[PDB]
Design a binder for this molecule. Structure first.
Ligand SMILES: Nc1ncnc2c1ncn2[C@@H]1O[C@H](COP(=O)(O)OP(=O)(O)O)[C@@H](O)[C@H]1O
Ligand SMILES: [Mg+2]
Ligand SMILES: [Mg+2]
Length: 332
């Protein structure tokens, strides 16, 4: 079966409207028949029965604001209009995941839906985005993240979407600012994938459904989109590839085609493990069809071999270097 836009507003309204267990029926869902209250740094406000103290704004995305808060810290994802969809996705993901996996993602504890917006209450990750981390390295002598950390993060990402895809979900927006580092990093274990607002639940579609939308909700395109070919899970493969590209070169990935072979731009000078990375980008960017998705496990093993061959000893020195950079930015 074929579907135009998996992010279409009327489509999501209908998918939610016809759920056996609609978001409105969750025990941790709360509906309110009033406007979204004003939310501001270092200020209290009423969120249902509870009074909530907001600290400072943690970050801003394409659609929403995420603040730190307490009544154990947690976050408030605030969005206009309301986004019950992200809450639905988050709920399903945590249901379908093996409990040992859930630490790689962000739990939503509750959702407060209003007439014109929503507040999603979720888990906190305290040490900024991967995009930010990449920026922190730009302002150092070394300029780029070390290979040990890059290969490490890359493997975790491959592992992450492997778990997500196993739940038959598509993240749909895998990029540097949707990866967060938490305090679990102080003790790749602390890396978390967040922002499920553009995610797709394939279980809500017939077996073998594919999509033809030639672009994302903010202009970005994956490989199949650039060729007007169909796609489902490939969009996440592209996202991971683009993310690792950004860790490697500090800029956003652009692709070219040469003889039916898709590959990222750049002359790849100053790039170590050139053979490993070319094989990585080859497999990630040249997916024949929706039926022949490359083994995420296999990709990660190839990175693991190189990692084990060069960086087992040194990862401790590398993560320390980063934590120092992270703490400096947080206290700032
Ligand atoms: N769990 C979290 N802990 C700390 N900051 C977060 C968390 N989740 C998101 N953020 C910050 O909020 C920003 C926007 O949130 P996100 O979920 O990406 O919404 P959007 O869909 O608008 O991108 C992110 O870029 C990130 O910096
Ligand atoms: Mg985001
Ligand atoms: Mg989003």
């Amino acid at each position: 079966f074929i579907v135009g836009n998996p992010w279409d507003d009327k489509l999501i309204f209908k998918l939610l409207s016809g759920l056996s267990k609609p978001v409105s029926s969750y025990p941790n869902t709360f509906e309110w028949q009033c406007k979204l209250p004003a939310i501001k740094p270092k200020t209290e406000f009423q969120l249902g029965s509870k009074l909530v103290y907001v600290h400072h704004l943690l970050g801003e995305g394409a659609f929403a604001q995420v603040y730190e808060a307490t009544q154990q810290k947690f976050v408030l994802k605030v969005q206009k209009p309301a986004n019950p969809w992200e809450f639905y996705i988050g709920t399903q993901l945590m249901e379908r995941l093996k409990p040992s996996m859930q630490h790689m993602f962000m739990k939503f504890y509750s959702a407060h839906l209003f007439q014109n917006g929503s507040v999603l209450v979720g888990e906190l990750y305290s040490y900024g985005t991967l995009l930010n981390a990449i920026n922190l390295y730009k302002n150092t002598p070394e300029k780029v993240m070390p290979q040990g950390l890059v290969i490490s993060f890359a493997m975790r990402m491959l592992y992450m979407i492997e778990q997500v895809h196993d739940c038959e979900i598509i993240h749909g927006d895998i990029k540097p600012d949707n990866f967060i580092l938490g305090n679990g990093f102080l003790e790749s274990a602390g890396l978390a994938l967040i922002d499920l607002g553009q995610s797709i639940d394939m279980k809500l579609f017939p077996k073998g459904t594919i999509f033809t939308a030639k672009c994302e909700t903010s202009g970005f395109q994956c490989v199949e989109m650039l060729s007007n070919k169909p796609w489902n899970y490939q969009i996440d493969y592209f996202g991971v590839a683009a993310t690792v590209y950004c860790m490697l070169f500090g800029t956003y990935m652009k692709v070219k085609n040469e003889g039916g072979e898709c590959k990222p731009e750049g002359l790849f000078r100053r790039l170590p493990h050139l053979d490993m990375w070319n094989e990585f980008f080859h497999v990630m960017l040249n997916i024949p069809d929706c039926h022949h998705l490359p083994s995420l496990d296999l990709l990660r093993q190839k990175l693991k071999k190189v990692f084990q061959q060069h960086y087992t000893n040194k990862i401790r020195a590398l993560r320390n270097r980063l934590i120092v950079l992270l703490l400096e930015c947080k206290r700032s």
